[PDB]
Amino acid sequence: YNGFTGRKITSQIFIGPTYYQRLKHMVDDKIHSRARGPIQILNRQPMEG
Amino acid sequence: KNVTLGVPRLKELINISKKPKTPSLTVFLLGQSARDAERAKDILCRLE
Amino acid sequence: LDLAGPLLAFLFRGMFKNLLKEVRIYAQKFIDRGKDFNLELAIKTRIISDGLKYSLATGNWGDQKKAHQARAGVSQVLNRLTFASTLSHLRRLNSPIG
């Protein structure tokens, strides 16, 4: 049954338990934002990493 | 017969390499040698 | 396949030969007087200890002054993410080809 309107979903969806693994990769550690921060010593360019 | 294709052949073309991996020469026949396989066989013997 | 035994043997021979080498250097240099000779001052344990500990620590495999010629990639840090990842990292092969 549809969640929002409660109407039946015409096609019959395939349901079953399957074993799922969370992965080490998570967006909180992959997010980065840069405005005029620290600067490299030799190149006078923004830092790496 | 096989021909190098894709990225390696593109390397042979862009590099203008001296010796390609698969050099090939196609040959066409003017006269009755074209339609008849006999004289064609004769040219086949004369080109090899 | 090179496991701990053959690898640590290949590593132990040359280091042991440096131990004997400095036993020869300090030995003879202390002998030229003809006074006497003392063993316990002729053996530097920093050779074996610091050498094994070093080449296990960094992973560069060989003499550290020869590290350019020395093969690298042996003895990575073990992966603790999952017990499966650890069992996998403990059972592995590494081809020397570049």
Binding site: - | - | A4, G5, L8, A9, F12, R13, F16, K17, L20, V23, R24, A27, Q28, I31, G34, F37, L39, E40, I43, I48, S49, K53
Partner: protein
């Protein structure tokens, strides 16, 4: 590696020839003991690997080799002193 190869590397090494008196050095046999730490005071203690991790120690064993030493003084008597647990 321990139970075989190390004795082969210690044994298969050539005896030390030196020199007029002569000085020869030979390695009899090699002995390991359970991993032990020698502290700042020099007090040995058995290390469990947990305290080895927590303190950044290195989990390792002391290595001892008997060393027989022969001196040749030309007086027909070559005196050999054998040292245990070098």
């Amino acid at each position: 590696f321990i139970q075989m190869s190390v004795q082969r590397i210690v044994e298969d090494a050539p005896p030390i020839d030196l020199q007029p008196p002569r000085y020869l050095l030979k390695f009899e046999q090699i002995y390991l003991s359970k991993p032990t730490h020698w502290e700042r005071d020099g007090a040995p203690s058995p290390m469990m690997p947990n305290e080895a991790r927590l303190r950044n120690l290195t989990y390792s064993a002391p290595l001892y080799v008997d060393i027989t030493k022969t001196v040749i003084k030309e007086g027909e008597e070559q005196l050999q002193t054998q040292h245990q647990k070098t």
